[PDB]
Structures are given as C-alpha cells and as structure tokens.
C-alpha cells in the first residue's frame, strides 16, 4: 500500500519512511527506478524496456567536480524539474523530515556519483536553497543505504562547506537533522577543527576557525564543548587546548578511516 521496496541499478533497498509517490505506484510489490534519469516505474517489464531505451548515463546539469571516478553534478530545480522531483521522492524514502518534493525550483541539487565503464552511479545528494535567508548551506542530505557509513556522506558534507568557502560565507545544515546526519556532522566538525588545531597552535580564535572552515561559530562552539576544548570568560567562549590533547582525540578509531577527500583543484564552481 505505501512504497516499501525499490529497485535501482543492481540494488533492492527497503523503504524507511513514507514518500508520496502516486497512489497507484505504492500498490505494486516494488517500485523500479532508472538509476540514471530516476524515472519510477511500476513493473519489471516497463523497467527493462526503459533500460534499453534510456539514453542517460549520468545526472543532468553540469559536472562541477570530477576526480578519478568520483563526480558531482549541479542540477538546478528550475532547469531539470522532473529529475529533481524524482530525486526528492526517492530521498523521502529515507528521510523522516523532508517535506518538499514538487516545488523544486528554489533549489539546486548536488548529486554524488561513482563512475564505471557503464556510467555514473548515484550514491546520494544534498539540496541547497539558492537563496537561504537563514544561512543554511544544506537543505536535505541523503546517502542511499548501500553507501552509508563508507565515507561518501563525509565527502558530501565537506563538499558543501567547500561551496560555502567559495561564497565567502559560513553555513550550517537546515534542522532537524537526521539521526545519521547528526552523527556525521558531529564527526566531521570534530575532525576538521581538530586537524586545524593540530596545524596551528596557534593563536586561532573561534572566529578564525569559522572563517577558515565556513563552519558557523555556533556549530564550532557546540563541537568544542563536546570535546571539552573551550573555556568561558566574562561572557565569551574561548579555545583552550594543548597540542597533546588534540593528538589524543585524533588518535581515536573515529578518525582512522582514510577519507575520500575533496580536491579543490578539481572543483569548478563560482557563486551564481
Ligand atoms: O553515510 C553517512 N555518514 N557516514 S560517513 O562514513 O560518510 C561519515 C560522515 C561524516 C564523518 C565520518 C564518516 C551519511 C552522512 C550524512 C547523511 C546520511 C543520511 C541521512 C539520512 C538518510 C540517509 C543517509 C548519511 F548516511
Ligand atoms: Zn532513464
């Protein structure tokens, strides 16, 4: 009765939440999605027919990042409305709190793919308001279940701050965050701030760290509080840490997986 399982590419994936695909699509045992254009179909036969006809082998929009077989496409919701609506309905399967599926024109979408000889395979994405009155640099961020906890979420969160740096602005993801999203941001912020605290020593203020990382002062403070690296003096949070305590944190299992890194040399983008 609601969609509860999808087939996309070589994966079958169970749903986590309701998504408002048309009612008729929910009635089927599975929903079949083209992994390139994201069209959703009701039958294995209409899916197989589509696979032989469809000419897409990557997302639409512009490839703004490519390094080896990792790529990011920027897709404006006004230029590619149907693709973006399809992506939003797919994402809502895994996001409890996303509420926008059809009115995609105010958004830009950054689609992460991993490329082989067959084409560019969607891993996840994040959406971002073209104009955010609140300074949100991510609206929703979703990594499909088979790629979760494998470094792709870390890449996309880093990528989102790389755009913010290019815009000379700080940014924070729109709340509420998902459960995975919270853990992932907390770990990313800790990593970035600890690595900057290692490389300086260093007369870095919180404002300094915000300008260097595009992480907001508030998210830096809440992170530094969770690491017990801040003292408070007459109304001001101030950094307080030894080089050694910084290394103790970084030696921990959390920060030991080799990251897929965002190479600024491979990013092609300027503020619109
Ligand atoms: O994969 C993830 N994080 N794990 S990760 O290895 O990339 C990572 C992230 C940050 C720090 C360290 C490791 C990840 C990161 C952000 C969002 C989601 C997500 C949220 C709701 C529904 C579906 C997915 C994630 F799954
Ligand atoms: Zn297709």
């Amino acid at each position: 009765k609601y969609v509860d399982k999808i087939h996309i590419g070589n994966y079958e994936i169970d749903a986590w939440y309701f998504s408002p695909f048309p009612e008729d699509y929910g009635k089927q045992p599975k929903l079949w999605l083209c992994e390139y254009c994201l069209k959703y179909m009701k039958y294995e036969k209409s899916y197989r027919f589509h696979l032989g006809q469809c000419q897409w082998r990557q997302p639409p929009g512009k490839e703004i990042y490519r390094k080896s077989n990792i790529s990011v496409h920027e897709v404006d919701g006004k230029d590619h409305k149907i693709y973006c609506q399809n992506l939003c309905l797919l994402a809502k399967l895994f996001l409890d709190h996303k509420t926008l599926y059809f009115d995609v024109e105010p958004f830009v979408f950054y689609i992460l793919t991993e490329v082989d000889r067959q084409g560019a395979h969607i891993v996840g994405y994040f959406s971002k308001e073209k104009e955010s009155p609140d300074g949100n640099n991510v609206s929703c961020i979703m990594i499909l279940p088979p790629y979760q906890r494998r470094g792709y979420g870390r890449f996309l969160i880093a990528f989102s701050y790389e755009l913010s740096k290019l815009e000379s602005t700080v940014g924070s993801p729109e709340k509420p965050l998902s459960d995975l999203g919270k853990l992932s941001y907390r770990s990313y912020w800790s990593w970035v701030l600890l690595e900057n605290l290692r490389d300086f020593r260093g007369t870095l203020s919180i404002k300094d760290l915000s300008q260097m990382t595009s992480i907001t002062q508030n998210d830096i403070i809440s992170t530094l509080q969770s690491l017990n690296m801040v003292k408070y003096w007459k109304g001001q949070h101030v950094i307080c840490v030894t080089p050694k305590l910084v290394e103790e944190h970084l030696k921990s299992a959390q920060y030991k997986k080799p990251p897929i890194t965002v190479d600024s040399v491979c990013l092609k983008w300027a503020p619109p």
Side-chain angles (χ1 to χ4, degrees), residues 1-26 28-272:
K1 182 249 220 194
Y2 296 162
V3 176
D4 57 59
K5 185 161 215 61
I6 63 167
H7 195 278
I8 179 168
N10 290 142
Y11 291 111
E12 298 234 327
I13 299 171
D14 291 325
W16 295 7
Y17 301 98
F18 171 70
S19 180
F21 298 92
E23 193 221 83
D24 33 313
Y25 285 97
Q28 321 298 336
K30 305 189 211 302
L31 206 61
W32 301 77
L33 278 67
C34 178
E35 67 173 305
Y36 309 113
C37 68
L38 301 176
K39 173 189 163 90
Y40 49 89
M41 288 161 275
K42 290 174 189 178
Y43 304 104
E44 183 171 7
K45 281 180 174 73
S46 50
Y47 173 70
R48 287 183 327 102
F49 188 72
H50 185 81
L51 249 29
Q53 303 300 305
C54 184
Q55 289 308 99
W56 299 45
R57 292 290 183 282
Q58 60 177 248
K62 176 172 194 175
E63 185 175 42
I64 62 167
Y65 185 89
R66 181 67 177 269
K67 193 177 174 174
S68 186
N69 71 320
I70 291 293
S71 61
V72 179
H73 281 69
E74 177 182 52
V75 183
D76 184 317
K78 171 137 40 59
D79 297 346
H80 303 283
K81 192 163 194 183
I82 291 309
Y83 176 89
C84 295
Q85 289 178 343
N86 285 346
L87 174 67
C88 287
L89 286 162
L90 163 61
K92 185 50 200 81
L93 298 165
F94 308 110
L95 295 170
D96 195 6
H97 299 124
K98 178 165 192 29
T99 63
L100 181 293
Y101 328 106
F102 307 108
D103 165 43
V104 294
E105 36 279 303
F107 292 82
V108 54
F109 299 79
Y110 291 89
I111 317 317
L112 170 71
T113 53
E114 171 168 276
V115 182
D116 74 356
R117 247 38 83 28
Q118 314 322 141
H121 301 97
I122 183 162
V123 166
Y125 80 108
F126 61 97
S127 51
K128 176 179 182 181
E129 286 171 297
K130 290 156 158 172
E131 286 276 354
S132 184
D134 320 294
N136 297 310
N137 65 353
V138 162
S139 178
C140 294
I141 173 163
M142 182 286 299
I143 294 297
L144 290 164
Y147 301 96
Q148 289 171 11
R149 306 182 186 253
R150 292 126 108 64
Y152 300 98
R154 192 214 190 264
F155 178 97
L156 273 184
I157 284 167
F159 194 89
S160 76
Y161 281 103
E162 288 306 313
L163 303 180
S164 291
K165 293 179 184 172
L166 291 167
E167 290 178 288
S168 307
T169 189
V170 290
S172 184
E174 191 179 327
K175 265 65 65 175
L177 284 179
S178 81
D179 295 332
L180 266 150
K182 284 192 175 113
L183 275 53
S184 297
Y185 274 95
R186 193 58 79 196
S187 166
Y188 170 85
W189 291 324
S190 295
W191 203 338
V192 174
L193 296 173
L194 285 167
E195 116 147 21
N196 283 109
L197 291 168
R198 155 195 286 165
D199 300 335
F200 292 64
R201 85 100 330 189
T203 339
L204 252 27
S205 58
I206 285 158
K207 286 191 206 213
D208 285 343
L209 288 172
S210 181
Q211 281 221 338
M212 291 162 66
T213 56
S214 283
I215 301 172
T216 61
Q217 293 196 40
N218 280 12
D219 290 336
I220 285 160
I221 289 155
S222 68
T223 301
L224 292 183
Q225 287 170 326
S226 75
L227 294 169
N228 201 203
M229 296 182 171
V230 46
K231 65 188 165 131
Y232 203 69
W233 195 248
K234 312 174 188 305
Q236 279 182 23
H237 299 273
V238 173
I239 299 179
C240 189
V241 79
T242 176
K244 254 51 94 281
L245 189 62
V246 174
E247 300 291 330
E248 293 309 312
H249 279 83
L250 285 172
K251 284 173 192 235
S252 101
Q254 197 174 152
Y255 307 116
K256 269 186 219 138
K257 274 202 250 174
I260 316 161
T261 48
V262 180
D263 185 340
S264 54
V265 170
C266 298
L267 212 205
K268 247 94 192 177
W269 188 81

